[PDB]
Amino acid sequence: TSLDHVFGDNSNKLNYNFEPMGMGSLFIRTMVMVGVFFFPVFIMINDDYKYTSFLDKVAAAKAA
Amino acid sequence: MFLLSVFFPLLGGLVNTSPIARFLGHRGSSIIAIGCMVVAFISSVVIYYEVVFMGCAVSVDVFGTWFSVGTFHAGWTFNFDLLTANMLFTVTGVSMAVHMYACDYMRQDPHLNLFLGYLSYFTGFMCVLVAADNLLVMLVGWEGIGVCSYLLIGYWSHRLSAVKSAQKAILVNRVSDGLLMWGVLWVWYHLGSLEYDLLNVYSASGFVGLSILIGAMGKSAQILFHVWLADAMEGPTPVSALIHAATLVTAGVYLLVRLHIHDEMFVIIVGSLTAFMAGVFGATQSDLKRVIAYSTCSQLGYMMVSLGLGETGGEASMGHLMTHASFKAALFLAAGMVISGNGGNQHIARYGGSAHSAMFTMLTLMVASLSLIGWPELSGFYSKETILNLAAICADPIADVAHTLLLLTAMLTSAYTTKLFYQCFMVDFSGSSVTPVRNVLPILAMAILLLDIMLKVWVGTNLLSGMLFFLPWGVKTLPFGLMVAGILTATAAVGSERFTLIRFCGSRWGFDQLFARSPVNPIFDLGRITWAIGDRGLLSVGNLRA
Amino acid sequence: GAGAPVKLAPRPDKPLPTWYELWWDNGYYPGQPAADFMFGAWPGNMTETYYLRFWSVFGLALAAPFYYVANFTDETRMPMVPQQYPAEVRDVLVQRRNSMLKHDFSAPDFKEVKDRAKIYWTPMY
Amino acid sequence: MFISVLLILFALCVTLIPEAHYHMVRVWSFVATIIPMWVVTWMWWNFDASGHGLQMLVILGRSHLAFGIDGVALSLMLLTTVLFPICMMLLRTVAGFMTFILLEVLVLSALCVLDLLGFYILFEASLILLFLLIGRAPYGSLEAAYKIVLYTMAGSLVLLPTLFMIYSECGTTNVLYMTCAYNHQTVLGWGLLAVLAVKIPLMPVHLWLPEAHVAAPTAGSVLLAGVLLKLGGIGFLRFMLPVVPEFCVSVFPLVSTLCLVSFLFSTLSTLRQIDLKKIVAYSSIAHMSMVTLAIFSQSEFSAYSSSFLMIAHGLISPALFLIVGILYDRAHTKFILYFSGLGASMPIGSTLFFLFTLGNLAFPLFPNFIAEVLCMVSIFAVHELLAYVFCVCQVLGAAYGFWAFNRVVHGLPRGPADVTRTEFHTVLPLLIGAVWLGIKPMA
Amino acid sequence: MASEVVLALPHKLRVMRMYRTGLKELINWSANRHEWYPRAYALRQEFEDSKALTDREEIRKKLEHGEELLARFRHWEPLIKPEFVGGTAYSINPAQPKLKFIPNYDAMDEYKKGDHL
Amino acid sequence: EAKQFTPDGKYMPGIFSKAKPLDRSTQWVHKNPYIEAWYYRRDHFENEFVWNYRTTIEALWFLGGFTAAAYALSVFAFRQADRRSGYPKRQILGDEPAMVLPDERQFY
Numbered sequence A: 001t002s003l004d005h006v007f008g009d010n011s012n013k014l015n016y017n018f019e020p021m022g023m024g025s026l027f028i029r030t031m032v033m034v035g036v037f038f039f040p041v042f043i044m045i046n047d048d049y050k051y052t053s054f055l056d057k058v059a060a061a062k063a064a
Numbered sequence B: 001m002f003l004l005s006v007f008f009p010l011l012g013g014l015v016n017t018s019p020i021a022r023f024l025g026h027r028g029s030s031i032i033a034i035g036c037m038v039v040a041f042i043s044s045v046v047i048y049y050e051v052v053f054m055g056c057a058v059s060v061d062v063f064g065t066w067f068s069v070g071t072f073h074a075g076w077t078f079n080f081d082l083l084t085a086n087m088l089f090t091v092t093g094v095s096m097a098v099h100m101y102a103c104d105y106m107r108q109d110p111h112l113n114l115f116l117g118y119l120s121y122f123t124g125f126m127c128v129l130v131a132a133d134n135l136l137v138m139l140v141g142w143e144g145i146g147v148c149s150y151l152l153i154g155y156w157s158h159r160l161s162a163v164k165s166a167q168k169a170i171l172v173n174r175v176s177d178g179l180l181m182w183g184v185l186w187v188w189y190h191l192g193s194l195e196y197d198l199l200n201v202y203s204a205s206g207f208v209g210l211s212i213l214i215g216a217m218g219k220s221a222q223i224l225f226h227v228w229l230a231d232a233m234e235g236p237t238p239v240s241a242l243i244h245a246a247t248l249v250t251a252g253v254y255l256l257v258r259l260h261i262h263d264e265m266f267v268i269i270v271g272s273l274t275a276f277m278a279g280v281f282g283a284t285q286s287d288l289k290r291v292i293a294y295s296t297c298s299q300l301g302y303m304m305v306s307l308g309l310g311e312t313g314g315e316a317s318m319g320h321l322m323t324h325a326s327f328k329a330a331l332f333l334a335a336g337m338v339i340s341g342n343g344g345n346q347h348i349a350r351y352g353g354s355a356h357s358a359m360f361t362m363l364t365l366m367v368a369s370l371s372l373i374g375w376p377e378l379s380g381f382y383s384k385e386t387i388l389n390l391a392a393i394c395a396d397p398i399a400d401v402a403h404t405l406l407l408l409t410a411m412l413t414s415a416y417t418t419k420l421f422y423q424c425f426m427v428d429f430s431g432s433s434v435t436p437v438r439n440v441l442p443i444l445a446m447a448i449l450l451l452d453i454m455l456k457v458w459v460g461t462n463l464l465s466g467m468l469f470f471l472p473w474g475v476k477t478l479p480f481g482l483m484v485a486g487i488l489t490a491t492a493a494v495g496s497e498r499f500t501l502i503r504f505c506g507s508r509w510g511f512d513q514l515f516a517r518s519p520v521n522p523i524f525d526l527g528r529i530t531w532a533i534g535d536r537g538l539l540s541v542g543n544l545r546a
Numbered sequence C: 001g002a003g004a005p006v007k008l009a010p011r012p013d014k015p016l017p018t019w020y021e022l023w024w025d026n027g028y029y030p031g032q033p034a035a036d037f038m039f040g041a042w043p044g045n046m047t048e049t050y051y052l053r054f055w056s057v058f059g060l061a062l063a064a065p066f067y068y069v070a071n072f073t074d075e076t077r078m079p080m081v082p083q084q085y086p087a088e089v090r091d092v093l094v095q096r097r098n099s100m101l102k103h104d105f106s107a108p109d110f111k112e113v114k115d116r117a118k119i120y121w122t123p124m125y
Numbered sequence D: 001m002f003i004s005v006l007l008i009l010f011a012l013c014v015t016l017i018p019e020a021h022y023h024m025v026r027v028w029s030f031v032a033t034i035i036p037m038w039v040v041t042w043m044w045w046n047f048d049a050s051g052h053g054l055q056m057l058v059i060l061g062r063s064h065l066a067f068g069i070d071g072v073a074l075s076l077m078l079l080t081t082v083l084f085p086i087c088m089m090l091l092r093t094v095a096g097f098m099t100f101i102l103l104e105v106l107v108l109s110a111l112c113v114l115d116l117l118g119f120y121i122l123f124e125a126s127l128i129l130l131f132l133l134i135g136r137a138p139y140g141s142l143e144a145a146y147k148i149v150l151y152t153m154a155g156s157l158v159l160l161p162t163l164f165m166i167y168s169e170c171g172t173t174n175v176l177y178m179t180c181a182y183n184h185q186t187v188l189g190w191g192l193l194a195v196l197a198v199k200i201p202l203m204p205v206h207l208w209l210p211e212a213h214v215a216a217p218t219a220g221s222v223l224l225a226g227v228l229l230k231l232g233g234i235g236f237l238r239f240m241l242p243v244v245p246e247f248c249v250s251v252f253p254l255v256s257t258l259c260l261v262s263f264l265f266s267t268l269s270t271l272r273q274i275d276l277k278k279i280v281a282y283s284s285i286a287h288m289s290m291v292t293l294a295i296f297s298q299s300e301f302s303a304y305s306s307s308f309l310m311i312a313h314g315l316i317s318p319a320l321f322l323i324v325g326i327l328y329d330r331a332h333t334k335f336i337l338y339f340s341g342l343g344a345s346m347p348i349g350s351t352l353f354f355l356f357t358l359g360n361l362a363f364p365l366f367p368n369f370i371a372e373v374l375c376m377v378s379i380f381a382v383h384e385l386l387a388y389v390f391c392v393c394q395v396l397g398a399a400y401g402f403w404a405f406n407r408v409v410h411g412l413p414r415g416p417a418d419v420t421r422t423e424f425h426t427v428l429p430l431l432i433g434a435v436w437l438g439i440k441p442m443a
Numbered sequence E: 001m002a003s004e005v006v007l008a009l010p011h012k013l014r015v016m017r018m019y020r021t022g023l024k025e026l027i028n029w030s031a032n033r034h035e036w037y038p039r040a041y042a043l044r045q046e047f048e049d050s051k052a053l054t055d056r057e058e059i060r061k062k063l064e065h066g067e068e069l070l071a072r073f074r075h076w077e078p079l080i081k082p083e084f085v086g087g088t089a090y091s092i093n094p095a096q097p098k099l100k101f102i103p104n105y106d107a108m109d110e111y112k113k114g115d116h117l
Numbered sequence F: 001e002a003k004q005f006t007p008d009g010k011y012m013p014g015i016f017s018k019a020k021p022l023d024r025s026t027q028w029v030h031k032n033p034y035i036e037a038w039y040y041r042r043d044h045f046e047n048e049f050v051w052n053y054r055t056t057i058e059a060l061w062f063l064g065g066f067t068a069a070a071y072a073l074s075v076f077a078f079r080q081a082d083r084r085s086g087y088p089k090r091q092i093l094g095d096e097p098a099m100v101l102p103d104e105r106q107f108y
């Protein structure tokens, strides 16, 4: 306590309850994080879908 | 002479950190560090004249093979070509003056030889990075400068904010390092080799350029990765000069210029957004080192756009890198001298007059500031005007918006650099400590970088200097008018009453605060879930009481 | 000036919170959160709602011009065509998807070169 | 074989030394583990790398117990013979010396056996030794010992009838004829997955490791981390992949998702740990998940890269356990809140801690960097996204590693003094091995 | 609005803290000290225009409005002297506390320096 | 001010000596009771698990959710690898009899 009159004392305490985040906030932020940090997975899934729909068009208009 | 540019700063670091330094002390270690940088600079000068001017590249098999399993073959091999010679000349020349400065700036530090050894290791890993001929020895250099940046940013380890700044630099760069590693996997898989001369790509699979761009955006501190760069001011002033001039931030731009496998839309958009963002960020700061840090981020944005423009744009990007290193290191060294003359204060509201600094420090700040703002027929004028004129004739419609962003950024840069000079010297005194530094070593350190600024005007970086891209006088001389507008506004010292815009920009758009809870707190909470609910909960098997 | 005074941080003298490892206590006063701005008052007393509200306008203010020029403006705005090359030099230069010579609307294979510059992501089989 | 009998009989003579001769007991038990290191180095000298896959064979009639050397077994045997004298330097009683001597006999014979019933007999004969080592009365934990023994017994009991099923199916448990006969691969594949997914910590059967690897003494932690986890990997590479390959293809999505969730969830749990030994203990699960996925990729040079990662982990993580053991031995706690400023008070120990922290995070000039690059080459060649998952999550490993280092090493200097000569020489062979295998591993 | 510490103060000290923080925030928002002097004079004249009040409701309304203003205009980058808390020179190279030394620890009780089992 | 060595080496235990000998336990930490209590509680945190609303919801969406995401990604990668290698549809566990294990004597 020899420096409390120079740099401040220990009377003011931290205002935080150390509690977990709310469930909806955690879910929404995790879904945004999955979308941002795993964007090659969505890009490649979209590539597979766009490729298979073209083969569907070919197989549809070919056998007619 | 060729291997002396790479090995020998690493040797200086090894000497000054080992128990050999217990016999030399501070006094002997300063001599060892300065000599070990002078030799490497002389070697790099010889390499520069041989390779750039006489066009004779040299390839050295140094330590045999590193590892070779299947068709994945990594060798301990260097290659010294035009880009490598450019980078080696720049890195060793800047690091020599920074060592000469640091031997006097950190004189009163208790562990001076440890600091000098860390600086030498950082320089040597940068030399290893640019001298490598394949991707894996490049990754040695990449992670080596990352580790040495961690050691040097958090040098004053008893201060918690410095420790957290070093950890932040490591983590932000670790994200981009992961993406760069995945890109190296793509490149090797679809081309069959790791050496640069066998990596000629016309049309690749998109993930290659994107992931290598993300890995470069980490080190060059572009948008959504710039957050570590401002906090890296916790380290001492020589660390900041070497981070912002020659090492670390120029590595991603070097990698993109070397590979040339990007897709230009992402590169142009990222670079121009970064330039405008860092321009408005540096206009609203009062910490003397943070303004210079944001100007570094802005110029890296300029170089990013230029390498987006094309092969000529890639050459202009390397040219602006080379000329930027000299005046940026000079700016940081002059700012360190001004800080030491004012009792350690870094706020520009507590400066003024011409008593707290030497005449040479004020001259250094003035000349490097004039080169940065593109004053005509100085060093930065040639490279910055080349990039601006190349952006004014690109046939991509995206480059139309990028050019406008660059012109606005140029006006902002001439505003806040003139503000940095005005607050430091022109206004009345508002500090209380006048201890001006006039030692020989930091003055000679500044004089060397000013000589390099003159050298870039006298001898160009490449053949683009003097080539005329044919533009009307209105398009050509507009950046001069934007420089004058910034100077007049900053000397008038005018301000606006829109305080909510002022506090949105001065708080740097809240990127750190939004990152404190969009990935970070969720990572902590998901760890709580995986431990408490999973390991202790759902998967836990209890005992059978009897 | 090494050896400056610094105040020490007190040890815990009360029961600890369950998730106490979100405070960084290094031994000196004051400690900090494990990541800055995760809790406690933000600088300038701003909040997350402040930044999200200002960004919900400012983000479209920055993304607006790029969209306009990428969808409502094309190669013909330029007063000149790109740099001209002999056929043996040009034919390898425009193989790069990166090249700015694909914006040459006076080339006889302008469309085919633009159709070959479409970015793909998954390499097909 | 005659040499192995002589080495066992020389090692077992520690019991007959009268206890009042302290110097002789120490020297005899240390030399009894030094000699097999020389013999295994000689076996590496004798190996013909352009010859057959199996060399130096011996088979003991109709008793099972057949032995042979390949590259994976030879590298793992070299690592074990390095690690056991360091364990001898960390013990003080004849009971400890004898437990580690019996463990060395069982590990060395299990690493190179070519019979499945012989592997079963040799490996889990170490169960009661591990129970007594972990649940030692004043300073161990009986809960941890019960957990590790019961999980291992559960997996082994699932395997044992399938072992006997293929034995009745073809007539032998020799791996050279088990790989050439027609067998019902789904049943035996499930039995082998059951043992080796407990030995390698794979979720959900992984909860024994955080208790056991922390409750063990420093020598026990060095052995358990650096050696005993890799018996699951050599189980995969020697027995399961050659004998049930159709199962090994069909189970790949399940093994793949187990490896991915083990990697991610164990990395997420490591961040909230507050015990230094528990921090070091969790980090091993993610590395073993990368090992298992690289083994199961079977794609480019998968055995090579996965064995090299096993060696790199077995060098780096015992050194971290050694540094935590020094801190615990001379400060009587393993709790992070009691340690700060260890750079000023233990500069050599903190330098070693930093170097092995960088090694554990797979930074270059350490064998983990080469290992993780080649493991991700093997994973990438099946699909690019299975490599991307490990690539993008590198910030999560560095977060816990640098957070633990920065919390205990910097700040206000409090804590014990720097390392002794003995502690430095316990650390030193691992550092030399790391520098060599990370700079010039091959010729 | 004021913090829970300032709301616990006596009225005289509450007004004093409000004037002091107003002067400091005017320092933080100004370019120089010579810019700050007439703003300090204007803030002093602003407090002098409410000195002779007696109605506690009007006093409370003025006090609460000024505290809202000070919560609005809290600078995001305050000017702190470097060697104090929040400064750039705080907690850099402190003197080491006394750490104890054990000489020749390996030589004490040799042959019995492991872990018990 | 203890004396644990003779002038020619020879460690002395000092069992009956007045001065406190420096030894292995000299730098053992003084235990803070609340820190010991918090570490004990975190060591036995499985006694605090309860099937309330938040526990059930987070165990469903994160643990089961990401496990299902990883299984779907693994099957996607397996099928895409088999298509990009020239293979037909291959038999994973519970997928009806089909092709497993390509033949090296065959060109796909």
Ligand SMILES: CCCCCCCCCCCCCCCCCC(=O)O[C@@H](COC(=O)CCCCCCCCCCCCCCC)COP(=O)(O)OCC[N+](C)(C)C
Residues within 6 Å of the ligand: D044, D047, D048, D049, D050, D051, D052, D053, D070, D071, D072, D074, D075, D076, D078, D079, D082, D303, D304, D307, D308, D311, D428, D429, D430, D432, D433, D434, D437, D441, D442, D443
């Ligand atoms: C599956 C292959 C085995 C590879 C496992 C990884 C090994 C880790 C380290 C890599 C070193 C590479 C060494 C290459 C040359 C050595 C000899 C050699 O060829 O290797 C042997 C085996 O190599 C070894 O045993 C390497 C030993 C590595 C273990 C090192 C760790 C232990 C040292 C600890 C630290 C000691 C420090 C002491 C100093 C104070 C056989 O492997 P292959 O060439 O694949 O066999 C050929 C296959 N066929 C016969 C069918 C044609």
Ligand SMILES: CCCCCCCCCCCCCCCCCCCC(=O)O[C@H](COC(=O)CCCCCCCCCCCCCC)COP(=O)(O)OCCN
Residues within 6 Å of the ligand: B007, B008, B010, B011, B061, B062, B063, B064, B065, D365, D439, D440
């Ligand atoms: C904790 C981290 C510390 C970081 C340390 C710094 C960063 C290091 C990063 C890279 C480390 C690589 C070290 C490799 C060591 C030797 C490997 C090669 C072994 C060998 O036998 O090779 C021969 C040795 O040659 C030679 O070695 C040359 C012969 C002797 C002449 C030069 C002497 C060396 C002077 C170096 C000064 C200080 C430099 C500091 C790095 C060269 O021949 P080959 O068989 O490969 O054949 C091919 C070309 N002929």
